[PDB]
Design an enzyme around this catalytic site. Sequence first.
Site, PDB file in Angstrom:
ATOM      1  CB  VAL A   1     -47.908 -26.357   3.662  1.00 38.65           C
ATOM      2  CG1 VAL A   1     -47.857 -26.392   2.150  1.00 38.65           C
ATOM      3  CG2 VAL A   1     -46.963 -25.292   4.204  1.00 38.65           C
TER       4      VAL A   1
ATOM      5  CB  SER B   1     -48.862 -27.075  13.468  1.00 38.94           C
ATOM      6  OG  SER B   1     -50.186 -27.056  13.978  1.00 38.94           O
TER       7      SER B   1
ATOM      8  CG  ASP C   1     -44.273 -37.408   9.036  1.00 35.62           C
ATOM      9  OD1 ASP C   1     -43.473 -36.446   9.152  1.00 35.62           O
ATOM     10  OD2 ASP C   1     -45.484 -37.239   8.752  1.00 35.62           O
TER      11      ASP C   1
ATOM     12  CB  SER D   1     -55.298 -29.945   4.860  1.00 36.34           C
ATOM     13  OG  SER D   1     -55.195 -31.343   5.088  1.00 36.34           O
ATOM     14  N   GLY D   2     -52.683 -29.354   7.454  1.00 33.00           N
ATOM     15  CA  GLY D   2     -52.156 -29.919   8.685  1.00 33.00           C
ATOM     16  C   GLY D   2     -51.994 -31.428   8.642  1.00 33.00           C
TER      17      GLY D   2
HETATM   18  C1  LIG Z   1     -44.458 -33.558   0.916  1.00 33.59           C
HETATM   19  C2  LIG Z   1     -45.506 -32.626   1.493  1.00 33.59           C
HETATM   20  C3  LIG Z   1     -45.353 -31.225   0.933  1.00 33.59           C
HETATM   21  C4  LIG Z   1     -46.613 -30.384   1.187  1.00 33.59           C
HETATM   22  N1  LIG Z   1     -44.143 -30.599   1.475  1.00 33.59           N
HETATM   23  C5  LIG Z   1     -43.468 -30.853   2.642  1.00 33.59           C
HETATM   24  N2  LIG Z   1     -42.175 -30.589   2.752  1.00 33.59           N
HETATM   25  C6  LIG Z   1     -41.710 -30.907   4.003  1.00 33.59           C
HETATM   26  C7  LIG Z   1     -42.636 -31.411   4.875  1.00 33.59           C
HETATM   27  C8  LIG Z   1     -42.513 -31.854   6.239  1.00 33.59           C
HETATM   28  O1  LIG Z   1     -43.390 -32.523   6.784  1.00 33.59           O
HETATM   29  N3  LIG Z   1     -41.339 -31.475   6.874  1.00 33.59           N
HETATM   30  C9  LIG Z   1     -41.065 -31.891   8.207  1.00 33.59           C
HETATM   31  C10 LIG Z   1     -40.933 -33.269   8.487  1.00 33.59           C
HETATM   32  C11 LIG Z   1     -40.661 -33.728   9.787  1.00 33.59           C
HETATM   33  C12 LIG Z   1     -40.521 -35.209  10.027  1.00 33.59           C
HETATM   34  O2  LIG Z   1     -40.421 -35.983   9.076  1.00 33.59           O
HETATM   35  N4  LIG Z   1     -40.496 -35.652  11.339  1.00 33.59           N
HETATM   36  C13 LIG Z   1     -40.074 -36.992  11.690  1.00 33.59           C
HETATM   37  C14 LIG Z   1     -40.504 -32.780  10.797  1.00 33.59           C
HETATM   38  C15 LIG Z   1     -40.629 -31.408  10.529  1.00 33.59           C
HETATM   39  C16 LIG Z   1     -40.909 -30.936   9.238  1.00 33.59           C
HETATM   40  C17 LIG Z   1     -41.014 -29.454   9.009  1.00 33.59           C
HETATM   41  S1  LIG Z   1     -44.157 -31.495   4.109  1.00 33.59           S
END
Ligand SMILES: CC[C@@H](C)Nc1ncc(C(=O)Nc2cc(C(=O)NC)ccc2C)s1
EC number: 2.7.11.24
Length: 338
Positions: A26, A33, A164, A28-29
């Site tokens: 999903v 990953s 994040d 583009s990294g």
């Molecule tokens: C909004 C973008 C679209 C494409 N969908 C997405 N759903 C969820 C996403 C994601 O990044 N989950 C995620 C966030 C963190 C984090 O926040 N670590 C502090 C950590 C692991 C994972 C797996 S991305």
Amino acid sequence: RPTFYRQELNKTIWEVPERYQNLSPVGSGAYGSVCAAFDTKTGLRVAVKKLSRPFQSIIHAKRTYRELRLLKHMKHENVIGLLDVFTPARSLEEFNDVYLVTHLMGADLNNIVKCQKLTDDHVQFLIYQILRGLKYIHSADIIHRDLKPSNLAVNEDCELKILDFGLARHTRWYRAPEIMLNWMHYNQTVDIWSVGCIMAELLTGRTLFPGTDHIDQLKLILRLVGTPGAELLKKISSESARNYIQSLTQMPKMNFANVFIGANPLAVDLLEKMLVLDSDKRITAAQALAHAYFAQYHDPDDEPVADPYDQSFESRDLLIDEWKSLTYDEVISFVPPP
Ligand SMILES: CC[C@@H](C)Nc1ncc(C(=O)Nc2cc(C(=O)NC)ccc2C)s1
């Protein structure tokens, strides 16, 4: 234990439990990953992130431990939470891979606003949800630090989740000036500045401060919020900073009502309260939530604070393997959701 299954997407290989089918690389990294998958056990779609070289160095091992700890703490509707964390190691000894699982969100704001501006009620609901999530994270002494549109995930529902958070430090377009300009100090209101820049972008459809670098960025901000006053310079501990600031062309603060023409004035007043240079005068997430602009969504009885969060590890200087063992312990004691 569960039955794992190997596979190789892009170039990287993935080893996840079988309960996770249809892995597809999903966004583009951009979020690292991450793969979208189907949760054969919940019938829900999740996002799977395989950490990149989790324990190559002390610093990586610490960031890995930091991430897991943060995700395990997050229990709020507007903040991404941990659905599952797993490793294909049967032993601490062979523990070298970490996979984190959260709900899968439809899109991020970096793109949806890229389809022309938003309606005021859409901004109210999105910004409201950001402030609720921020009130929760800040209540636990956590700061996002890099709040940005690509860091805000939403569903077709317009349901929103912050991602994040608390990774950055210990893009510049949304950065608070007390971070840009050397470091005249700061606090959690550094996230409010970001929300201010974001709200602005959503309302107009344009980057509020499209800085070319640290100096061009600052220049763009002062033009709007004006040159630092006496009360503000009095608080600047950086002799360096006091030089630059006090030396450039004095600019007056502009009339937001004039810069954001035709926008809901309630929105403009809120933007005025977030975009102040002085971090002690900036409005808080909790205070912002009570701002009339949010009359339609605000509910003091459903705007929860977070349990306390032990951030003491942050101060520790340990060996790679010690961070690894700690991460291993955290993966082990993980307790899924309801
Ligand atoms: C909004 C973008 C679209 C494409 N969908 C997405 N759903 C969820 C996403 C994601 O990044 N989950 C995620 C966030 C963190 C984090 O926040 N670590 C502090 C950590 C692991 C994972 C797996 S991305």
